[PDB]
């Protein structure tokens, strides 16, 4: 079977995901694009304070660099 | 033949604890892993470091291996 | 053909917001970019993270891609 | 003749070691495997507060990533 | 037709620039040299407290390592 | 006639050295082995409070990962 | 031929100040350097950042180039 963590990211295409960065900040938006570096493009992205549902800021369509990602919640829509 | 990374495959479908560089602890069932130690965990709960106090639920998570400190590969068997 | 880096090219000559590793935010018109996400911004203002409180003005800046957290590539159409 | 730091890690196999990571936390356990990048597997691993013998948490069998290791006390067994 | 970020660093040669480093500190001086990795030589370099005009220390002629640079204000002279 | 920084590390073999790690802590011991990546083996390693002489912990024979070293005092024995 | 790394070579046998990523400053006579900016300083004294307060003496030190923020290659003219 060919399943590996990277292609699991492709299944999240056009779904709401949560991205947490190395500084602990959390960003929620719809995953529009991703590449093999885990560079992401998120649509209608809102930053939330860590571990909470408190919106901090809206940033629109964001390109997130993969090297500073801690993790991506790929099923986040089904859980919000 | 045995090496640290093959030990990671023995934890597939088992509950593991992953500690990241910032000290926070994530507990979940190991679904997938690769050679760089990127992981996919199912039903992932973040705990406050050193405790069993849950702080957040994140569902199915892709964790980047570069930020991992260690993985408790038999965590199921010690709780 | 769509991918993250090409989406950056769509923001050329538009105002973007760039957040760096230390959390600081910089807003200015994207004049140039390369494959490593080095950017040149014009009329760049730094803002306190998460606000519209101006902190400093830096003129035309060359931002090193390796220390960028993210780029809001549609910032002009929402600010 | 052939003596180098990474070979000295081979003589600690199945001995108790102390591993200190980049955030100053110390982990004690029996070294079961190591590779060339200093990835480690420890059995019966206990975290202790830095500089002390106050145990903080028990983690069982752990795979430690080499890149965040500060040092390994390779003769810890014979001293603690 | 050839416009790239690093080429614009070459336009600032012999001009006063502001370099902000990863720790937030700001260094002002005349750019004398740069290379492809963004290593720089500044002449008559003064550090300023971040976002102010309070000088904190003088360092003279400095070789700055590119990997810790956040940004360079390549036209800082025109705006003082 | 050939002199470079890594070769100067070999001159400290069998001498007491001080190693400062990137979290600021200092470790003093007799350098027994080293390699091209500045991985080190120290014998009789004592950690000291940064910048002081107050011992903090003993760790015996330690393998130090070169990538997390700030500097090595290669003549410390002659000035301690 | 002039470039930033060759400018380090000109500092040989000169007193330099080396600032590391954690902000600590180290002053000594530059004895050796290489292409990665690994340095050997003679008679090295560490100073509290931005001040003249000596904190510790370290003799002959080998500094790893990867943790260096900057090197004042002419520092005796500044002391």
Domain positions in chain F: 5-78
Domain E5-79 has CATH 2.30.30.100: yes
Q: Check G77 against E60: CB less than 8 A apart.
A: yes
Cβ-proximal residues to C59 (8 Å cutoff; 6+ apart), any chain = C43, C44, E73, E74, E75, E76, E78, E79
Q: Check F64 against D71: CB less than 8 A apart.
A: yes
Among F22, F35, F63, the residue with its CB nearest the CB of D72 is F63
Q: D5-36 burial, b for 16+ CB within 10 Å, e for fewer?
A: bbebbeebeeebbbbbbbeebbbbbbbbbbee
Nearest Cα of chain A lies from the Cα of C59 at a distance, in angstroms, of 22
How many Å is the maximal CA-CA distance in chain B?
39
Q: Smallest Cα–Cα separation from C32: which of E6, E18, A63, E70?
A: E6
For residue G79, the chain E residues in CB contact (below 8 A) are none
CA distances, E70 to each of B10, C11, E43 (Å): 42, 21, 19
Architecture of domain A5-78 in CATH?
Answer: Roll (2.30)
Chain C residue whose CA is closest to E20: C63
What's the token pair of residue F14?
């069998």
Q: Check E70 against C55: CB less than 8 A apart.
A: no
CB B29 within 8 A of CB B53: no
Segments of G1-79 assigned E as strands? 15-20, 25-33, 39-47, 54-63, 68-72
Q: E25-34 burial, b for 16+ CB within 10 Å, e for fewer?
A: bbbbbbbbbb
Measured CA to CA, the distance from residue B62 to residue A18 in angstroms comes to 10
Cβ-proximal residues to D32 (8 Å cutoff; 6+ apart), any chain = D13, D14, D41, D42, D43, D61
> Torsion-angle region of residue E36: left (phi > 0), alpha (psi -120 to 50) or beta?
alpha
Domain G4-77 has CATH 1.20.1250.20: no
Technique behind the model: X-ray
For residue B15, the chain D residues in CB contact (below 8 A) are none
Q: Check B4 against D41: CB less than 8 A apart.
A: yes
Q: Check D59 against B65: CB less than 8 A apart.
A: no
Q: What is the DSSP letter of A39?
A: -
For residue D5, the chain F residues in CB contact (below 8 A) are 33-35, 39-41, 63
Contact: chain G with chain E (3+ CB pairs below 8 Å): yes
How big is the CA angle at F51 (ends F45 and F52), to the nearest 5 degrees?
70
What's the token pair of residue A55?
């919106």
Contact: chain F with chain C (3+ CB pairs below 8 Å): no
The three-class DSSP label of residue E76 is helix
Q: Check D60 against B72: CB less than 8 A apart.
A: yes
For residue G4, the chain E residues in CB contact (below 8 A) are 33-35, 39-41, 63
CB G28 within 8 A of CB G43: yes
The three-class DSSP label of residue E46 is strand
Q: Report the DSSP beta bridge partners of residue B70.
A: B19, D64
Measured CA to CA, the distance from residue C17 to residue A62 in angstroms comes to 9
Domain B4-78 has CATH 2.30.30.100: yes
Chain E residue whose CA is closest to G72: E62
Among F5, F51, F79, the residue with its CB nearest the CB of G59 is F79
Contact: chain D with chain A (3+ CB pairs below 8 Å): no
Q: Report the DSSP beta bridge partners of residue A18.
A: A28, A73
DSSP per-residue string spanning E15-26: SEEEEEETTS-E
Q: What is the CATH number of domain C4-74?
A: 2.30.30.100
Header resolution in angstroms: 2.1
Measured CA to CA, the distance from residue E20 to residue C46 in angstroms comes to 12
Among D5, D22, D51, the residue with its CB nearest the CB of F63 is D5
> Torsion-angle region of residue C23: left (phi > 0), alpha (psi -120 to 50) or beta?
left
């Amino acid at each position: 079977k060919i399943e590996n963590p990277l292609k699991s990211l492709k299944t999240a295409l056009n779904k709401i995901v949560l991205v947490k960065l190395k500084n602990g900040e959390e960003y929620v938006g719809r995953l529009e694009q991703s590449d093999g570096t885990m560079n992401l493009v998120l649509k209608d992205c809102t930053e939330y304070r860590e571990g909470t549902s408190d919106p901090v800021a809206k940033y629109g369509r964001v390109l997130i660099r993969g090297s500073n990602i801690l993790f991506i919640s790929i099923d986040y829509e089904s859980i919000m």
